[PDB]
C-alpha cells in the first residue's frame, strides 16, 4: 500500500484523508485559531508518540503575549526538524475560493483564506479543505511528498 | 504523469527548483545568458536523435518536418522543444522588465566585440537594487530546473 | 533607528470582519507620503482597532537594538531593554512574493503565519529585501 | 527495586540529556496530564507533552525537552518531586477545615 | 488572561491554562510553594453523610 | 439565500465549506425546500384518470 497511493486509471491519489480528517485539520488552520506555548506543545506531541524531535519556530504574535498560529503547528508535521529532508512547494485553489477584486489583488488576497501558498514547508495562506489533502485533485499535499 | 497528461508540471517544478536553490548572495544572470545555459544541456540531447530517413541513411537538413520521414519517435523530440520554449517565454519577461525599468534589455546576445559591456556602472545603483530585488534567476536555478 | 527598514503614519479606512470573530482585515492610507497604502490582518481581542484612527507601522529587523546551539527558539530574559518596549503590538513573518503594481510602483507581500499583508510603494521602501525575518511594530 | 517502569528511549534521545523520551507502564492520563502542568512551570523546559500510543495496551510515553541549562532527566526528577509537594498543600489545608467545619 | 471562560451564544473562549512562564516577556508566575500556599483556600458548603459539597 | 445569510460556526455549513461530506444542495433541502422530485426524466406523471 506504499506503491499504490495512486490509481492507474487517471493518476490521481486515492488514499488520503477521509470525511472526518478534513474537518479536524480545518479547525486548526482556521485563521482565528491561536495557541500559546504549552498548548502547541501538547498539540505537537500527539501527532507522534514522543519519538520525533521538534524544534519550535518563533511565534507569530509576539509583543502582548506569545502566540503561535494554526499553520505553524501544521507546517511542523511536514518538516519537523532539520534532519528531515521534506521541503515542498505548492500552489492550489481551494473548494470554494471566493474571488478577490479580480484585477489588482492576486489570487492570494481572497475574502476568506482561499488560495493556499506553501514555500519551503511553511503554510503562508489558505486552509485544508479536501482540495489540498483529500482525494481526486492531482495537486494535493500528500501527492507532493509522494 | 502530472497534470493534463504531461509528466512535467512545469509550474511546480520551477517553483520547487527556485526555493531549493535560492540565495541573494549569489549574483544572477542576464536574459541572453540563461538560454545558453539551457542549450548547453538539452543541446547534446537533441543530436543523439539522428532523424534517419525511411531507408537506413540520414536525410537532408532541408525540409525535415514533411510528414513523410516521421520515424519511431517524434514526441520525445517535440518534448525538448517545449522545454526550451517554456524558458524562452520566461527569458523575455526579465528582458521586458529591465527594458521599461530604464536599463537596456539585451535579449539578443552580443557578438565578438567588447566582452563585458556590463551596464552595472552606467545606470545608478538604484536600478541594480530594483530589478534583482523584484525577481532574479541564478545560474544554479537553471541547472536544477531542467 | 539602526535596524528600522521602514516607518510611516497611517490613517485607517475600513474594518471588515468577514465571517470571523477574532481577526479582521484593515485598510490604511499614508498621511505623509501620498502614494503608499496597505491592507493588514489584526487580531482585535488584544489590540482593538476602530475606523479612522492613526497608528504607526515600523518594519524593523533583529529588535535587539545592538550587536545555545539548540536550533529552537527562546524568548529574551525578563530584564532587558530592547526595541518595542514602547509600542503596543508587534508581529512576525516572512516575505514571499515581490511584484510591480504599475510603472514605478512595486508591491510587497508579507505573511505573518496565516495573516497576510500587502503594501505597495514607489521605490521609497528601498531597504525591504527578500530576507527571512522582518517584524512589524505598531503603536496606537 | 523494580525496572519495568520509567525508562529512557535511547532511539529518540540527544547525545546528552537535553532531549529525552520515556515510556511509563501502568499509568494513564491521571498522571500524564498532572505531570505536564507541574513541569512546564520550570523556566528551563521548552517542550513537555505526552501521548498514549494505543488504548489496547497500557503504557504512557512522556516527552521532555529543554534548553542547555539542565538536563531533561534532571528536569522531571525535579518535576515529579514538585507534584509531591503540591499535594501537601492541598491535603493539609483541606483537613484543617474539616476539623473546623 | 483574567482566568474567565467566556460564555457566548455559540462558543466558549480561552478555556486553556495560560499559567506558565514563557507566555509573556515578563516571565512571571513561576513555581513557588509559598506563593501557592497563600492563595489556595477551601470553603466547605453543606456537608452531611452520603453527600459532600465543597470548593477548591 | 440560505448560505450567505447564515452565521459562522454553523455545523452543516463548516463541513460543506470543506469537502468532507455534504453539499449546498443537501443542506438546502434541510432548511429551505426539498424541490421537485423526478421519476426517470419525468415529473411524476399521472396515476389514474
Amino acid at each position: 500500500v506504499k506503491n499504490n497511493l495512486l490509481t492507474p486509471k487517471s493518476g490521481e491519489p486515492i488514499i488520503a484523508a477521509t470525511q472526518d480528517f478534513i474537518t479536524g485539520s480545518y479547525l486548526i488552520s482556521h485563521k482565528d485559531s491561536f495557541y500559546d506555548r504549552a498548548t502547541l506543545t501538547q498539540l505537537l506531541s500527539m501527532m507522534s508518540d514522543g519519538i520525533e524531535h521538534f524544534d519550535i519556530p518563533p511565534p507569530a504574535i509576539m509583543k502582548p503575549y506569545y502566540l503561535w498560529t494554526g499553520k505553524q503547528v501544521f507546517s511542523l508535521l511536514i518538516k519537523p526538524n532539520h534532519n528531515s529532508p521534506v521541503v515542498i512547494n505548492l500552489d492550489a485553489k481551494n473548494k470554494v475560493f471566493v474571488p478577490p477584486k479580480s484585477k489588482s489583488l492576486p489570487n492570494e488576497m481572497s475574502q476568506n483564506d482561499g488560495f493556499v501558498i506553501i514555500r519551503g514547508s511553511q503554510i503562508l495562506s489558505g486552509v485544508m479543505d479536501k482540495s489540498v489533502l483529500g482525494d481526486g485533485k492531482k495537486h494535493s499535499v500528500f501527492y507532493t511528498i509522494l | 504523469m502530472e497534470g493534463n497528461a504531461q509528466p512535467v508540471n512545469f509550474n511546480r517544478s520551477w517553483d520547487h527548483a527556485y526555493n531549493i536553490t535560492f540565495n541573494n548572495q549569489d549574483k544572477g544572470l542576464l536574459p541572453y545568458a540563461i538560454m545558453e545555459t539551457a542549450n548547453e544541456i538539452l543541446g547534446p540531447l537533441e543530436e543523439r536523435l539522428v532523424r534517419y530517413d525511411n531507408s537506413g541513411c540520414l536525410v537532408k537538413r532541408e525540409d525535415l518536418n514533411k510528414a513523410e520521414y516521421v520515424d519511431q519517435y517524434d514526441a520525445e523530440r517535440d518534448f525538448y522543444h517545449s522545454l526550451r520554449e517554456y524558458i524562452n517565454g520566461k527569458a523575455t519577461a526579465l528582458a521586458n522588465l529591465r527594458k521599461s525599468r530604464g536599463m537596456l534589455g539585451l535579449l539578443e546576445p552580443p557578438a565578438k566585440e567588447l566582452q563585458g559591456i556590463d551596464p552595472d556602472e552606467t545606470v545608478p545603483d538604484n536600478v541594480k537594487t530594483s530589478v534583482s530585488q523584484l525577481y532574479r534567476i541564478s545560474e544554479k536555478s537553471v541547472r536544477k530546473f531542467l | 533607528m539602526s535596524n528600522t527598514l521602514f516607518d510611516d503614519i497611517f490613517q485607517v479606512s475600513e474594518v471588515d470582519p468577514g465571517r470571523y470573530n477574532k481577526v479582521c482585515r484593515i485598510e490604511a492610507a499614508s498621511t505623509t507620503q501620498d502614494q503608499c497604502k496597505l491592507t493588514l490582518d489584526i487580531n482585535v481581542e488584544l489590540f482593538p482597532v476602530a475606523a479612522q484612527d492613526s497608528l504607526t507601522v515600523t518594519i524593523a529587523s533583529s529588535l535587539n537594538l545592538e550587536d545555545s546551539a539548540t536550533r529552537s527558539w527562546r524568548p529574551p530574559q525578563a530584564g532587558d531593554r530592547s526595541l518595542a518596549d514602547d509600542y503596543d503590538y508587534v508581529m512576525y513573518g516572512t516575505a514571499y512574493k515581490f511584484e510591480e503594481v504599475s510603472k514605478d510602483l512595486i508591491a510587497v507581500y508579507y505573511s505573518f503565519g496565516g495573516l497576510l499583508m500587502r503594501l505597495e510603494g514607489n521605490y521609497r521602501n528601498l531597504n525591504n529585501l527578500k530576507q527571512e525575518n522582518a517584524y512589524l511594530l505598531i503603536r496606537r | 527495586p523494580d525496572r519495568e517502569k520509567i525508562k529512557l528511549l535511547t532511539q529518540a534521545t540527544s547525545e546528552d540529556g537535553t532531549s529525552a523520551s520515556f515510556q511509563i507502564v501502568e499509568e494513564d492520563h491521571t498522571l500524564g496530564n498532572a505531570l505536564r502542568y507541574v513541569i512546564m512551570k520550570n523556566p528551563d523546559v521548552e517542550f513537555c507533552g505526552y501521548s498514549i500510543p494505543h488504548p489496547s495496551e497500557n503504557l504512557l510515553n512522556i516527552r521532555i525537552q529543554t534548553y542547555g541549562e539542565t538536563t531533561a532527566v534532571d528536569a522531571l526528577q525535579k518535576g515529579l518531586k514538585d507534584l509531591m509537594d503540591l499535594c501537601d498543600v492541598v491535603e493539609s489545608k483541606f483537613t484543617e477545615k474539616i476539623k473546623s467545619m | 488572561m483574567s482566568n474567565i471562560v467566556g460564555i457566548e451564544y455559540n462558543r466558549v473562549t480561552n478555556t486553556t491554562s495560560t499559567d506558565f512562564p514563557g507566555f509573556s516577556k515578563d516571565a512571571e508566575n513561576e513555581w513557588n510553594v509559598e506563593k501557592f500556599k497563600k492563595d489556595f483556600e477551601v470553603n466547605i458548603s453543606s456537608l452531611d453523610a452520603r453527600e459532600a459539597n465543597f470548593d477548591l | 439565500v440560505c448560505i450567505n445569510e447564515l452565521d459562522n460556526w454553523n455545523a452543516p455549513l463548516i463541513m460543506a465549506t470543506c469537502g468532507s461530506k455534504g453539499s449546498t444542495l443537501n443542506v438546502s433541502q434541510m432548511v429551505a425546500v426539498v424541490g421537485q422530485q423526478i421519476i426517470s426524466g419525468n415529473r411524476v406523471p399521472d396515476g389514474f384518470q
Side-chain angles (χ1 to χ4, degrees):
Chain A
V1 78
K2 291 184 177 71
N3 303 320
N4 296 118
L5 273 79
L6 295 174
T7 173
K9 177 170 70 173
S10 66
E12 67 189 2
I14 206 66
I15 297 168
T18 58
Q19 53 89 31
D20 204 6
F21 289 162
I22 287 100
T23 192
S25 64
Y26 173 78
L27 301 177
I28 289 173
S29 71
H30 199 198
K31 188 181 281 186
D32 50 354
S33 69
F34 292 154
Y35 303 106
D36 51 350
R37 185 185 285 274
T39 309
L40 174 137
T41 283
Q42 180 57 253
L43 186 63
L44 205 69
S45 173
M46 296 186 287
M47 64 173 69
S48 64
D49 288 331
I51 303 298
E52 294 288 329
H53 185 275
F54 294 95
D55 46 352
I56 308 300
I61 302 302
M62 187 182 288
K63 199 262 184 295
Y65 312 111
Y66 288 103
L67 275 303
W68 282 259
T69 185
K71 298 176 174 65
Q72 284 173 349
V73 75
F74 200 79
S75 299
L76 285 174
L77 62 88
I78 293 168
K79 186 171 77 65
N81 51 8
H82 59 87
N83 288 321
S84 67
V86 178
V87 48
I88 63 174
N89 299 110
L90 181 147
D91 302 329
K93 191 181 289 184
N94 280 334
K95 186 71 185 293
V96 280
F97 182 62
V98 54
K101 277 77 175 176
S102 298
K103 296 297 289 184
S104 298
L105 283 78
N107 294 317
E108 291 85 1
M109 291 293 173
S110 71
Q111 287 81 13
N112 57 1
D113 199 2
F115 188 74
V116 68
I117 290 297
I118 174 171
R119 296 293 175 86
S121 300
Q122 284 86 20
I123 300 300
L124 299 176
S125 68
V127 296
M128 297 293 170
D129 56 356
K130 163 68 167 62
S131 174
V132 200
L133 292 173
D135 298 333
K137 277 80 172 179
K138 190 72 68 69
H139 54 80
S140 69
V141 172
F142 295 153
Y143 186 82
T144 301
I145 305 106
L146 176 65
Chain B
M1 295 178 83
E2 284 80 2
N4 283 319
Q6 278 71 234
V8 276
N9 193 2
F10 290 116
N11 293 319
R12 185 182 64 80
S13 66
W14 179 264
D15 289 328
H16 176 68
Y18 184 74
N19 201 171
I20 201 164
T21 57
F22 182 77
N23 193 0
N24 55 4
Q25 301 297 320
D26 288 330
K27 177 66 176 68
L29 294 183
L30 280 80
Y32 72 95
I34 60 100
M35 292 301 293
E36 292 295 324
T37 62
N39 286 317
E40 186 182 0
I41 300 298
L42 53 92
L45 266 294
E46 293 182 356
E47 287 97 11
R48 289 182 62 249
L49 306 185
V50 292
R51 189 63 179 271
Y52 290 167
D53 64 355
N54 288 319
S55 299
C57 65
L58 281 79
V59 77
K60 303 297 182 183
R61 299 282 81 81
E62 292 293 324
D63 192 64
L64 294 169
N65 47 3
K66 61 187 288 186
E68 189 176 0
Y69 297 106
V70 176
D71 57 356
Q72 58 189 359
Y73 45 81
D74 192 75
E76 182 177 357
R77 187 180 295 121
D78 195 77
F79 176 68
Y80 299 107
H81 292 86
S82 295
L83 200 146
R84 178 184 294 115
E85 199 271 334
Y86 179 74
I87 308 169
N88 195 2
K90 196 175 293 296
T92 63
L94 182 60
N96 293 322
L97 188 274
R98 67 186 294 163
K99 185 260 180 183
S100 177
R101 293 278 80 84
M103 202 185 288
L104 180 63
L106 60 160
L107 177 61
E108 300 294 326
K112 300 286 103 177
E113 55 94 21
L114 192 148
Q115 298 294 318
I117 49 97
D118 193 73
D120 181 75
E121 68 268 10
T122 62
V123 294
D125 56 354
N126 197 2
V127 181
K128 271 75 66 175
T129 58
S130 174
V131 173
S132 180
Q133 294 300 107
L134 263 68
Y135 69 100
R136 59 188 295 169
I137 293 167
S138 176
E139 192 265 331
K140 180 69 180 297
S141 294
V142 185
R143 297 297 185 190
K144 295 295 289 293
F145 170 68
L146 49 87
Chain C
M1 184 178 72
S2 176
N3 295 116
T4 298
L5 275 72
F6 179 78
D7 190 76
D8 274 327
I9 304 297
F10 293 157
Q11 185 180 3
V12 299
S13 175
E14 183 181 0
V15 175
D16 183 76
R19 304 292 299 277
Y20 292 111
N21 293 112
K22 200 162 88 271
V23 173
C24 60
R25 178 173 287 171
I26 62 101
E27 297 290 325
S30 183
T31 188
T32 63
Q33 173 57 256
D34 291 330
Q35 186 63 259
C36 65
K37 61 187 178 182
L38 57 77
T39 63
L40 180 60
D41 290 328
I42 306 297
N43 46 355
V44 295
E45 75 169 358
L46 71 162
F47 183 71
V49 66
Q52 294 174 356
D53 190 74
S54 177
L55 52 90
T56 308
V57 171
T58 302
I59 300 171
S61 174
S62 297
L63 261 57
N64 56 0
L65 191 64
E66 70 178 3
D67 183 77
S68 68
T70 57
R71 298 294 304 273
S72 298
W73 183 79
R74 66 175 299 166
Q77 290 84 16
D80 276 327
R81 61 184 297 275
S82 70
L83 186 54
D85 293 332
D86 52 354
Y87 288 158
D88 289 333
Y89 174 77
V90 318
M91 292 170 75
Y92 176 88
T94 73
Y96 65 95
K97 183 175 176 63
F98 298 150
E99 49 91 25
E100 67 273 18
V101 176
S102 69
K103 192 262 187 294
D104 70 6
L105 290 174
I106 54 98
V108 165
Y109 295 99
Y110 281 103
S111 73
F112 303 105
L115 301 172
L116 289 166
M117 186 180 75
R118 175 184 186 269
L119 61 85
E120 66 276 20
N122 54 2
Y123 295 160
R124 181 180 175 87
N125 52 9
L126 192 274
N127 294 113
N128 291 320
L129 277 72
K130 196 177 181 294
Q131 77 271 19
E132 175 66 28
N133 305 118
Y135 311 22
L136 247 66
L137 282 84
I138 290 95
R139 74 176 73 187
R140 192 184 295 275
Chain D
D2 58 352
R3 53 190 66 250
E4 294 88 4
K5 288 298 287 187
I6 182 78
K7 178 166 70 176
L8 202 151
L9 272 298
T10 60
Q11 296 293 322
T13 184
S14 65
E15 66 273 15
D16 49 355
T18 300
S19 298
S21 64
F22 293 92
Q23 180 177 359
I24 304 170
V25 184
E26 196 71 24
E27 296 173 1
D28 56 352
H29 301 282
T30 75
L31 188 64
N33 205 173
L35 189 62
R36 201 277 315 279
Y37 172 71
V38 73
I39 279 175
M40 194 61 74
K41 299 180 79 67
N42 184 5
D44 198 6
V45 51
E46 74 169 359
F47 188 82
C48 181
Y50 75 101
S51 173
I52 307 300
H54 195 69
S56 175
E57 67 187 5
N58 195 5
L59 57 91
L60 180 144
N61 284 322
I62 180 69
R63 176 70 176 178
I64 181 67
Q65 173 173 353
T66 175
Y67 304 118
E69 294 294 326
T70 61
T71 58
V73 64
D74 288 329
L76 67 88
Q77 288 178 353
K78 184 258 183 66
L80 56 88
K81 192 262 188 295
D82 193 61
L83 172 57
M84 185 189 295
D85 293 332
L86 175 52
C87 295
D88 295 331
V89 183
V90 178
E91 186 180 2
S92 173
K93 185 69 73 177
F94 178 73
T95 193
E96 80 182 6
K97 192 62 69 179
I98 287 287
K99 267 65 178 299
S100 175
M101 179 63 207
Chain E
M1 202 60 208
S2 177
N3 65 11
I4 290 170
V5 175
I7 309 295
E8 69 177 13
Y9 68 96
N10 57 5
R11 296 177 296 168
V12 304
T13 51
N14 63 8
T15 66
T16 59
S17 67
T18 173
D19 199 359
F20 67 95
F23 177 71
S24 181
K25 180 174 73 69
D26 48 355
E28 63 178 0
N29 60 21
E30 304 171 353
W31 181 263
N32 194 0
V33 180
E34 295 92 9
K35 291 292 183 181
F36 177 76
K37 194 183 286 185
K38 297 177 177 64
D39 296 332
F40 178 73
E41 64 183 1
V42 177
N43 299 121
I44 301 169
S45 182
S46 67
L47 172 63
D48 52 353
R50 204 71 63 86
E51 188 177 3
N53 193 2
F54 56 92
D55 301 341
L56 269 69
Chain F
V1 179
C2 295
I3 299 302
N4 209 165
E5 296 178 353
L6 194 63
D7 58 348
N8 52 3
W9 306 108
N10 202 150
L13 194 278
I14 200 164
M15 74 182 83
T17 306
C18 299
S20 69
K21 182 173 287 295
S23 68
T24 185
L25 184 273
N26 296 318
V27 65
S28 65
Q29 292 184 354
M30 295 172 74
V31 68
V33 60
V34 297
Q36 195 271 326
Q37 283 79 13
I38 198 70
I39 302 171
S40 68
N42 193 1
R43 58 174 188 91
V44 189
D46 55 352
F48 50 93
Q49 293 293 321

